[PDB]
Design a protein around this ligand. Structure first.
Ligand SMILES: [Ca+2]
Ligand SMILES: [Cl-]
Lengths: 496, 44
């Protein structure tokens, strides 16, 4: 639950948020495989309650009604096809596992569900699993409302209903077994691992108890004895009763401090400066690097009200976003996940985006296919940040420099910064309102290197900026504050 | 900026206040409110 089980040399995951399975398969074959991505985090593949008010929001998929692999992303055949095709090109599949709860306790009974299964939330009846009343934590929860009333009480956080969602009795062997059966079906299909949704709301030992029931990964693609990669979603910015460290025994943990703090720095809010990033990582009070799953934004906080607030950088702020993502992908801290989004019509009213609920691009609830434009961008309102040259080349960067130590840090005492990764890569940022022009030790062998942010090494030439590194490892870097991308990155596989 | 905002779960975020409106629900003990309540509505 700790080794990502990505194909050798691949060091990142991309969240293909709300993508259809067939589109993911195609993207794996045509793009993610060749471009060195380690894997894809997929939206919950299990059947969820249909929410019609508002019209099919994205968050309906976090309200399960069964474990049938039957969603707006596709059916079981398409999911299997996706996992097979992706694994066959060295791209792993990681499932968003929603296991703390079922749908809303206040939902009506009936077949308004993505596969047409019946459920009766009020009577805790989910016959398609099956679950019944004694499979939920209603008798365990100690609050008057039956919901979570206070985050100061870890018992309430774990045993009560999260925003009215029916809370499963994860202490019970039966529930653990149903969940394990679901996850094991996914593993046998060929899944490499799981994002554990709402981990704060489950006891660490219940999660462990579930993980211990899990099969080894499918030996068609993985070595014998391979354990699923596990990363648990826990939001802990500090100061609450529940700490991230409680979950370190189960696998990696999402480090939400990362994108919040990085966002604050790159936006230059609160007196923050990029030069402060010298001791980025555990030096900022973050969790151990080998416990962290890191990211600039996720599907929640990219909409301006998740963990981090307005400080979070997103595709809407593409230039600074690219700066932050590039820094993260160059820096050794954590295991990196890049977000891939669709654009919705944002509408801020009194600080709230009232369209932050809008689901993926669709015709009458049917999700639109991912179309590829001639310039390699996507149509149909898929943003495809993972296709941006500045981001994909940094994914490759991260693959190239994997294992190399932090080295040759430089800063201007302000917002111009640089560092390398052993002798295999180097990166330079200008976030000041004036020209960057410095001669820096890159740690790299002498030669001419293509800047992979402004361009590419294509055969034996550069399509963008060229950096000449002398034999002593020093090079001149010139970056205007008005540059389209005010940072340059070079590595061993970009040398001419 | 950062602003006031207290994230609870997918599709549920509140506003940090000392006390919540008649039609709002309260969540105590959230660090980002700094002693305040998180005042939210669920979209269901
Ligand atoms: Ca729970
Ligand atoms: Cl997450």
């Amino acid at each position: 639950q700790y080794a990502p089980q990505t194909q050798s040399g691949r060091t990142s995951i991309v969240h293909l948020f709300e993508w259809r399975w067939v589109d993911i398969a195609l993207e794996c074959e045509r793009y993610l495989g060749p471009k060195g991505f380690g894997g894809v985090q997929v939206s919950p593949p299990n059947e969820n309650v249909v929410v019609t008010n508002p019209s099919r929001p994205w968050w309906e998929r976090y309200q399960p009604v069964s474990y049938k692999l039957c969603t707006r992303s596709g059916n079981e055949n398409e999911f299997r096809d996706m996992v097979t095709r992706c694994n066959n090109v060295g791209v792993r599949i990681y499932v968003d596992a929603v296991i703390n709860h079922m749908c809303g306790s206040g939902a009506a009974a009936g077949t308004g569900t993505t596969c047409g299964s019946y459920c009766n939330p009020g009577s805790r009846e989910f016959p398609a699993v099956p679950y019944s009343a004694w499979d939920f934590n209603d008798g365990k929860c100690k609050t008057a409302s039956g919901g979570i009333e206070s985050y100061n009480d870890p018992y309430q956080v774990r045993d009560c209903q999260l925003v009215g969602l029916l809370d499963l009795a994860l202490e019970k062997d039966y529930v653990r077994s149903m969940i394990a059966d679901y996850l094991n079906k996914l593993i046998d299909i060929g899944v490499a691992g799981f994002r554990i949704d709402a981990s704060k709301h489950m006891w660490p030992g219940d999660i462990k108890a579930v993980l211990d029931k899990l099969h080894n990964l499918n030996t068609n693609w993985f070595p014998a004895g391979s354990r699923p990669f596990i990363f648990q979603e826990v939001i802990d910015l500090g100061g609450e009763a529940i700490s991230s460290s409680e979950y370190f025994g189960n696998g990696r943990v999402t480090e939400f401090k990362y994108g919040a703090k990085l966002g604050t720095v790159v936006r230059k809010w609160s007196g923050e400066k990029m030069s402060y990033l010298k001791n980025w990582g555990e030096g900022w009070g973050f969790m151990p690097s080998d416990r962290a799953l890191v990211f600039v934004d996720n599907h929640d906080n990219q909409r301006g009200h998740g963990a981090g607030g307005s400080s979070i950088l997103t595709f809407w702020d593409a230039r600074l976003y690219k700066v932050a993502v590039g820094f993260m992908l160059a820096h050794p801290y954590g295991f990196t996940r890049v977000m891939s989004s669709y654009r919705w019509a944002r509408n801020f009213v009194n600080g709230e985006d009232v369209n932050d609920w809008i689901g993926p691009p669709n015709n009458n609830g049917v999700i639109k296919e991912v179309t590829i434009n001639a310039d390699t961008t996507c149509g149909n309102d898929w943003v495809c940040e993972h296709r941006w040259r500045e981001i994909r080349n940094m994914v490759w960067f991260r693959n190239v420099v994997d294992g190399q130590p932090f080295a040759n840090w430089w800063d201007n005492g302000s917002n111009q910064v640089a560092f390398g990764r052993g002798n295999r890569g180097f990166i330079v940022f200008n976030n000041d309102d004036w020209q960057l022009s410095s001669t820096l030790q890159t740690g790299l062998p002498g030669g001419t290197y293509c800047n992979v942010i402004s361009g590419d090494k294509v055969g034996n030439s550069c399509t963008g900026i060229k950096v000449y590194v002398s034999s002593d490892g020093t090079a001149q870097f010139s970056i205007s504050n008005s540059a389209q991308d005010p940072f340059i990155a070079i590595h061993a596989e970009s040398k001419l | 900026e950062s602003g006031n905002s207290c994230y609870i779960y997918h599709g549920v975020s509140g506003i940090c206040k000392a006390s919540c409106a008649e039609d709002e629900k309260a969540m105590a003990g959230m660090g980002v409110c700094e002693g305040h309540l998180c005042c939210y509505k669920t979209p269901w």
